[PDB]
Amino acid sequence: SWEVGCGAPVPLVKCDENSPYRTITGDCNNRRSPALGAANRALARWLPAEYEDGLALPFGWTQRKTRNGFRVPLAREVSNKIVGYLDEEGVLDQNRSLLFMQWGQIVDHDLDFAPETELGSNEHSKTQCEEYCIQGDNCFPIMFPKNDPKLKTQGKCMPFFRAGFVCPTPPYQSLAREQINAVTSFLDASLVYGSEPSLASRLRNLSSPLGLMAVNQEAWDHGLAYLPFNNKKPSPCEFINTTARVPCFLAGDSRASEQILLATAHTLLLREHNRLARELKKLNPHWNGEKLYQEARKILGAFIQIITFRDYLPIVLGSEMQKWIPPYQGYNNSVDPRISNVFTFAFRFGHMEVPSTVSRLDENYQPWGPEAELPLHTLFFNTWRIIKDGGIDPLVRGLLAKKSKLMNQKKMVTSELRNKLFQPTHKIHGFDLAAINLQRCRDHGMPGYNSWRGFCGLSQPKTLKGLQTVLKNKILAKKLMDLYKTPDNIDIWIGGNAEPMVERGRVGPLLACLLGRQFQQIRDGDRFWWENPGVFTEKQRDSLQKMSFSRLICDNTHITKVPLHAFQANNYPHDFVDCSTVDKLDLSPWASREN
Ligand code: HEM
Ligand SMILES: *[C@@H]1O[C@H](CO)[C@@H](O[C@@H]2O[C@H](CO)[C@@H](O)[C@H](O)[C@H]2NC(C)=O)[C@H](O)[C@H]1NC(C)=O
Ligand SMILES: *[C@@H]1O[C@H](CO)[C@@H](O)[C@H](O)[C@H]1NC(C)=O
Ligand SMILES: *[C@@H]1O[C@H](CO)[C@@H](O)[C@H](O)[C@H]1NC(C)=O
Ligand SMILES: *[C@@H]1O[C@H](CO)[C@@H](O)[C@H](O)[C@H]1NC(C)=O
Ligand SMILES: [Br-]
Numbered sequence: 226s227w228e229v230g231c232g233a234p235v236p237l238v239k240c241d242e243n244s245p246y247r248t249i250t251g252d253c254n255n256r257r258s259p260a261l262g263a264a265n266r267a268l269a270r271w272l273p274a275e276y277e278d279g280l281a282l283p284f285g286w287t288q289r290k291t292r293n294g295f296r297v298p299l300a301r302e303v304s305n306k307i308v309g310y311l312d313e314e315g316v317l318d319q320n321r322s323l324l325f326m327q328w329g330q331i332v333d334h335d336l337d338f339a340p341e342t343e344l345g346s347n348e349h350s351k352t353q354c355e356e357y358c359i360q361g362d363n364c365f366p367i368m369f370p371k372n373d374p375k376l377k378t379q380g381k382c383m384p385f386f387r388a389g390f391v392c393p394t395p396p397y398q399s400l401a402r403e404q405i406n407a408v409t410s411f412l413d414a415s416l417v418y419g420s421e422p423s424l425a426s427r428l429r430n431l432s433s434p435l436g437l438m439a440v441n442q443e444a445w446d447h448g449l450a451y452l453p454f455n456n457k458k459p460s461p462c463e464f465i466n467t468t469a470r471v472p473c474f475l476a477g478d479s480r481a482s483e484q485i486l487l488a489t490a491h492t493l494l495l496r497e498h499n500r501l502a503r504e505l506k507k508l509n510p511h512w513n514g515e516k517l518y519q520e521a522r523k524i525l526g527a528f529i530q531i532i533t534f535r536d537y538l539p540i541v542l543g544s545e546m547q548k549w550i551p552p553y554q555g556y557n558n559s560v561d562p563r564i565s566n567v568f569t570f571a572f573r574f575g576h577m578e579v580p581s582t583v584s585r586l587d588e589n590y591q592p593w594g595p596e597a598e599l600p601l602h603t604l605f606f607n608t609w610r611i612i613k614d615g616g617i618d619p620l621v622r623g624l625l626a627k628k629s630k631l632m633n634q635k636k637m638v639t640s641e642l643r644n645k646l647f648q649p650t651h652k653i654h655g656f657d658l659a660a661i662n663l664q665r666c667r668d669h670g671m672p673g674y675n676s677w678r679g680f681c682g683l684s685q686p687k688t689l690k691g692l693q694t695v696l697k698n699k700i701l702a703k704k705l706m707d708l709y710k711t712p713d714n715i716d717i718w719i720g721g722n723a724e725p726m727v728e729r730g731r732v733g734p735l736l737a738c739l740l741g742r743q744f745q746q747i748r749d750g751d752r753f754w755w756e757n758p759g760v761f762t763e764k765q766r767d768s769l770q771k772m773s774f775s776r777l778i779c780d781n782t783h784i785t786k787v788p789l790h791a792f793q794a795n796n797y798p799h800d801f802v803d804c805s806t807v808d809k810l811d812l813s814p815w816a817s818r819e820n
């Protein structure tokens with residue numbers, strides 16, 4: 226009885242139970258439940274789903290159906306009233322670099338992706354949502370409220386299609402709708418290699434037998450590699466500048482060209498692979514095609530893990546790090562490694578850390594030419610600016626020398642994302658990521674703010690006065706009350722992001738709990754966690770310690786100087802040492818004397 230294990234996208238994999246490398250799919254990590262953490266399975270439910278009809282319909286779908294006796298406010302009205310602001314002066318994070326934001330996104334992309342259903346692309350039901358704004362099946366449009374200026378320029382709604390669900394589309398009744406995670410729940414560089422055997426092979430250089438990833442043929446970066454292009458036509462990247470006609474990149478993760486600094490990070494990571502496949506080949510000429518591909522992958526997988534747990538999480542989690550992510554005690558095959566549905570909204574705290582502009586800096590960390598600083602909205606699905614406007618060195622310099630946006634209760638999401646988002650299969654720089662996030666919380670059946678505060682053992686405010694105390698903000702609380710009427714109805718994404726930050730952290734208490742717990746699980750439930758005995762050799766492990774984001778940059782770019790601590794705010798030249806003092810990865814401990 227009950228669900229008892231459903232899923233359509235599961236197929237044809239035999240576990241090689243003593244293999245030394247991860248599957249691409251994530252299958253076989255947990256030997257007693259081989260599908261746990263595998264790509265293309267339902268996101269985990271830490272709490273039961275909450276839908277308007279119990280099974281599948283999002284709160285907000287039917288106008289007369291309340292949540293807890295009140296209508297849920299339109300996602301766009303929530304965005305306009307609470308999330309927006311005009312003035313970028315004074316928003317920057319004085320002790321986080323931009324790389325802090327961008328690493329966040331890399332990590333997120335390693336861990337989760339819940340992709341939109343295609344009900345009818347090859348039909349104009351997908352432009353029946355766009356053009357007519359008609360709710361139905363997987364079309365769930367974000368309707369504009371009364372005084373929205375997008376009414377005057379953009380029509381009635383922003384189109385939105387519901388996330389795909391397991392046992393696939395579009396009929397699903399008897400049990401509750403569970404959304405898919407299309408990437409491996411393990412922190413394993415699946416964003417570099419793919420989470421599907423088919424993609425992971427297409428990405429590889431299967432002409433030389435040297436364990437390499439395919440590089441751009443068409444274009445190179447002063448010799449250094451670009452990712453290959455996706456020859457999808459239509460490329461949304463071509464669309465944003467048809468004169469330049471430069472396509473999107475092809476990577477392990479389908480979202481790699483969403484924004485130019487994500488694309489840039491992917492580039493660095495690929496380079497670091499193909500570089501590792503070269504240096505291993507000189508160190509061990511006995512090694513064949515896979516051997517080189519798997520050993521490099523395995524290294525890069527570890528790098529991600531170390532930077533994330535050593536450098537990134539302590540500065541998001543601050544004083545709460547210890548409470549949730551104690552020192553690693555070993556692989557615990559009882560721990561659920563799966564990504565939870567709520568984590569995929571919790572980790573969207575990063576949307577508040579993205580600033581309005583991106584800079585290209587030259588070799589003296591100075592403005593690279595006349596258009597050096599660009600508005601963020603010009604850089605969505607923009608690969609042409611990497612290629613025909615300076616390569617990645619100047620963007621990486623910007624990444625290190627510039628700052629992230631600081632989360633601010635009065636200045637939450639820059640207008641670059643809130644009014645000017647570009648969606649593929651849409652024409653316009655006119656979408657709203659905050660609104661989209663709120664619609665998505667509802668799409669995914671998220672429990673409200675107080676259920677999560679309950680989950681995390683935090684107080685649950687019922688009153689305007691209660692909320693003011695929890696948020697430490699009268700005005701913000703009054704605005705949430707006017708819109709939602711009860712704190713029980715507040716969507717988790719806005720709720721968790723409105724809380725003041727923990728000391729030394731960049732998230733509030735509720736998010737630190739949700740995030741912290743999921744990352745603990747990611748580590749403890751991973752058999753191939755880099756420091757689990759026997760995944761690497763002791764020799765290799767003391768070498769892995771050396772790794773830094775600074776060294777990643779020195780190797781896969783023509784940059785000569787970099788900070789020691791790349792995630793905190795760093796000012797040039799005062800904080801910039803040379804690539805020579807950035808400790809290199811010692812690759813001797815992988816040298817095998819084995820015919
Ligand atoms: C320029 C920067 C960014 C852009 C343009 C961007 C855009 C997007 C978009 C379009 C989505 C899909 C939203 C949906 O349909 O529900 C998304 C989801 C997401 N964003 Fe971002 N975002 C960026 C930065 C970040 C950062 C810095 C983080 C984390 C630190 C992050 C974490 C995520 C997560 C977790 C998801 C959910 C992924 C999934 O499971 O499907 N985002 N973002
Ligand atoms: C696979 O890697 C090899 C390099 O080892 C690439 O082959 C070279 O490509 C160009 C011709 O376009 C020339 O430099 C040489 O004739 C080739 N080199 C060698 C060593 O034979 C090949 O392009 C790679 N493929 C991908 C997709 O990355
Ligand atoms: C910047 O933040 C880090 C925590 O990552 C801390 O070690 C350092 O003291 C901070 N520096 C300043 C000057 O605030
Ligand atoms: C498109 O790219 C061309 C060639 O790189 C460049 O000269 C131009 O500024 C770009 N135009 C737009 C509208 O983005
Ligand atoms: C995790 O591992 C520990 C030690 O084996 C075990 O006692 C516990 O039940 C497991 N579950 C979790 C993650 O708490
Ligand atoms: Br994205």
Ligand SMILES: [Ca+2]
Pocket residue numbers: 335336408409410411412413414415416
């Ligand atoms: Ca992964």
